[PDB]
Design an enzyme around this catalytic site. Structure first.
Site, PDB file in Angstrom:
ATOM      1  N   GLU A   1     -59.172  58.247 -30.885  1.00 25.60           N
ATOM      2  CA  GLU A   1     -58.056  57.934 -30.795  1.00 25.60           C
ATOM      3  C   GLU A   1     -58.748  56.770 -29.656  1.00 25.60           C
ATOM      4  OE1 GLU A   1     -55.975  56.770 -31.842  1.00 25.60           O
ATOM      5  OE2 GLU A   1     -54.510  58.901 -34.040  1.00 25.60           O
TER       6      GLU A   1
ATOM      7  N   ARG B   1     -58.718  53.243 -29.997  1.00 27.38           N
ATOM      8  CA  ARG B   1     -58.215  52.565 -29.606  1.00 27.38           C
ATOM      9  C   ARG B   1     -58.450  51.700 -27.915  1.00 27.38           C
ATOM     10  NH1 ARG B   1     -51.819  54.071 -30.923  1.00 27.38           N
ATOM     11  NH2 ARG B   1     -52.517  55.794 -32.463  1.00 27.38           N
TER      12      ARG B   1
ATOM     13  N   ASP C   1     -59.975  58.224 -44.879  1.00 28.15           N
ATOM     14  CA  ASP C   1     -60.354  57.432 -45.251  1.00 28.15           C
ATOM     15  C   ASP C   1     -61.558  55.899 -44.192  1.00 28.15           C
ATOM     16  OD1 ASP C   1     -57.343  56.666 -42.926  1.00 28.15           O
ATOM     17  OD2 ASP C   1     -58.872  57.400 -42.760  1.00 28.15           O
TER      18      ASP C   1
ATOM     19  N   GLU D   1     -51.922  48.911 -43.011  1.00 33.47           N
ATOM     20  CA  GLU D   1     -52.817  48.781 -43.644  1.00 33.47           C
ATOM     21  C   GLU D   1     -53.038  47.528 -44.682  1.00 33.47           C
ATOM     22  OE1 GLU D   1     -53.590  51.370 -41.075  1.00 33.47           O
ATOM     23  OE2 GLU D   1     -51.761  51.547 -42.093  1.00 33.47           O
TER      24      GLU D   1
ATOM     25  N   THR E   1     -62.055  49.815 -36.723  1.00 32.70           N
ATOM     26  CA  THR E   1     -60.183  50.223 -37.335  1.00 32.70           C
ATOM     27  C   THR E   1     -58.660  49.891 -36.645  1.00 32.70           C
ATOM     28  OG1 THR E   1     -59.715  51.861 -38.772  1.00 32.70           O
ATOM     29  CG2 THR E   1     -60.006  52.944 -36.421  1.00 32.70           C
TER      30      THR E   1
HETATM   31 CA   LIG Z   1     -57.749  51.172 -39.925  1.00 37.03          CA
END
Ligand SMILES: [Ca+2]
Ligand SMILES: CC(=O)N[C@@H]1[C@@H](O)[C@H](O)[C@@H](CO)O[C@H]1O
Length: 510
Positions: free
Chosen positions: A99, A103, A242, A396, A486
């Site tokens: 994370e 981020r 994913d 998404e 992402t």
């Molecule tokens: Ca993503």
């Protein structure tokens, strides 16, 4: 009109941003309903969770706004000064490597990039911050012999700590969704160490598990760091799985390293062979789960997170080129392209068939074996379990819609995006009839009407959801010059020759 939709999305962003700046400025977590906030670290020091994740969206909007350009500029300045003078990552607290990398490190890198190409703000502020954070995060790669990092790390001491649950196994996607960030940082600093450490995780993962041969490139969501071996777990394209696939392709798009495209291709063919299916009665394409190995049954349950696949497949097939040009290239994959349209359509249907026009966190497609207390979609293509009815402002689907529009130029995608933007506006708003107090928040239930609000605004509502909706309505956006991390933080495609001169090459093979 595109410009008008632009004004409306910028308006929604600013309504959320003005409220956050007024009540929770500098805080990691913020609840719009009660205007409450707090920081994540036990010591209460901020991580810049919302500000850093949002800076690049401010820059993108500042760049094209016709009604609020001046406001966006001031907010970029506000954010930059805070990042430079207040934010301090020397925090005695354990944070999730994944994370924080996607981020915070990613947001600082994209802020640097946009500050650079857009000539707004002081790029140096972001780069210096990124180098320091990157160094704190990089210590995670020194914990195991395989090079696979434990889930968390102390930003001050550099001490690593295994996942509290799952027998101590790390989430597969968590250590395979750090490559774009560390490689771009290696490129900017000329520091090969970041690149070497992040690429190292693949060899044990592929070799110790016979990933290509035994699993057809499909990864169980848990991998033990010390051995590099998969733990008995579900194989899914949802959470914890994913982005492993996402970054195989994205590394190739970012650095031109062909090995990753080859690995991506293997996983995609494996996905089509073992996880792909169609729903009843609309025959919507969806990717299912395998909870008991590849030889087990296929589960029609699908996380909304899987919806990023529409844009990934389209991106991988076109390499960013409009189909008009891509369709004539040797690398164009007809299969991937048709599936990209298919998956994007299915994900759009998760909104269109929803009572609120918003897709919940998880859905269960109708495979003909749906035989209780579940909610059935309008057409009946999917169901929603009572416990999965929440909506966390996830991006998404609008993410994939953005890619499909810019690559195909099919206006249908802008129509879909507009409908979804409208549904978010009408069903997640608080003080909906007062532009001066209006805000947007998550939902504990997006199926019941009126929807039930939750007191929390995800950083990605600003970093991703509104950003992708915004880009969807930009008339000019060259997907061949940028690769999104992402968390939707855009990095520039790197020059192969410069990478070579920096000795940044693929340090392993298969
Ligand atoms: Ca993503
Ligand atoms: C034109 C300008 O302001 N440049 C500044 C520089 O003076 C400062 O050392 C650096 C780190 O904050 O950020 C940038």
């Amino acid at each position: 009109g595109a410009g008008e939709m632009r004004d409306r999305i910028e308006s929604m962003f600013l309504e959320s941003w003005r409220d956050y700046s007024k009540h929770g400025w500098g805080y990691d977590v913020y609840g719009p309903i009660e205007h409450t906030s707090h920081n994540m670290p036990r010591g209460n020091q901020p991580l810049g969770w919302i500000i850093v994740d949002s800076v690049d969206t401010l820059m993108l909007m500042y760049n094209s706004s016709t009604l609020y350009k001046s406001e966006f500029e001031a907010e970029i300045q506000r954010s930059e000064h805070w990042i430079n003078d207040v934010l301090d990552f020397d925090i005695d607290a354990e944070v999730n490597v994944f994370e924080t990398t996607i981020r915070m490190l990613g947001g600082l890198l994209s802020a640097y990039h946009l500050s650079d190409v857009l000539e707004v703000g002081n790029k140096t502020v972001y780069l210096n911050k990124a180098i320091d954070l990157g160094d704190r995060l990089a210590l995670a790669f020194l914990s195991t012999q395989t090079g696979i990092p434990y889930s968390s790390i102390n930003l001050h001491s550099g001490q690593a700590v295994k996942n509290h649950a799952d027998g101590g196994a790390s989430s597969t996607a968590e250590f395979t969704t750090l490559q774009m960030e560390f490689k771009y940082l290696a490129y900017l600093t000329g520091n090969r160490t970041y690149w070497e450490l992040v690429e190292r995780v693949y060899e044990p993962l592929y070799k110790n598990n016979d990933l290509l041969n035994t699993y057809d490139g499909l990864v169980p969501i848990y991998t033990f760091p010390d051995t590099g071996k998969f733990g008995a777990s579900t194989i899914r394209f949802g959470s914890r799985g994913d982005s492993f696939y996402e970054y195989l392709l994205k590394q190739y798009l970012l650095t031109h390293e062909t090995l990753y495209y080859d690995l991506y291709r293997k996983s995609m063919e494996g996905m089509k062979k073992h996880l792909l299916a169609q729903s009843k009665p609309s025959s919507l394409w969806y990717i299912g789960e395998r909870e008991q190995g590849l030889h087990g049954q296929l589960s029609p349950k699908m996380d909304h997170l899987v919806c990023f696949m529409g844009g990934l497949l389209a991106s991988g097939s076109t390499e960013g080129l409009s189909i008009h040009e891509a369709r004539r290239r040797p690398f164009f994959s007809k299969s991937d392209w048709d599936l990209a349209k298919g998956i994007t359509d299915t994900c759009y249907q998760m909104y269109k068939q929803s009572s609120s026009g918003l897709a919940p966190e998880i859905v269960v497609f109708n495979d003909g074996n749906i035989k209780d207390g579940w909610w059935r979609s309008s057409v009946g293509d999917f169901f929603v379990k009572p416990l999965d009815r929440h909506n966390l402002q996830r991006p998404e689907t609008v993410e994939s819609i953005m890619f499909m529009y810019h690559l195909s130029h099919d206006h249908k995608y802008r129509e879909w995006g507009a409908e979804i933007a409208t549904s978010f506006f009408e069903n997640t708003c608080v003080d909906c009839n007062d532009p001066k107090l209006r805000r947007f928040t998550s939902l504990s239930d997006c199926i019941t009407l009126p929807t039930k609000k939750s007191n929390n605004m995800e950083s990605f509502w600003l970093a991703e959801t509104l950003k992708y909706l915004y880009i969807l309505f930009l008339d000019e956006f060259d997907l061949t010059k940028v690769v999104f991390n992402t968390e939707a933080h855009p990095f520039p495609v790197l020059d192969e020759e410069i990478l070579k001169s920096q000795s940044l090459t693929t340090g392993w093979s298969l």
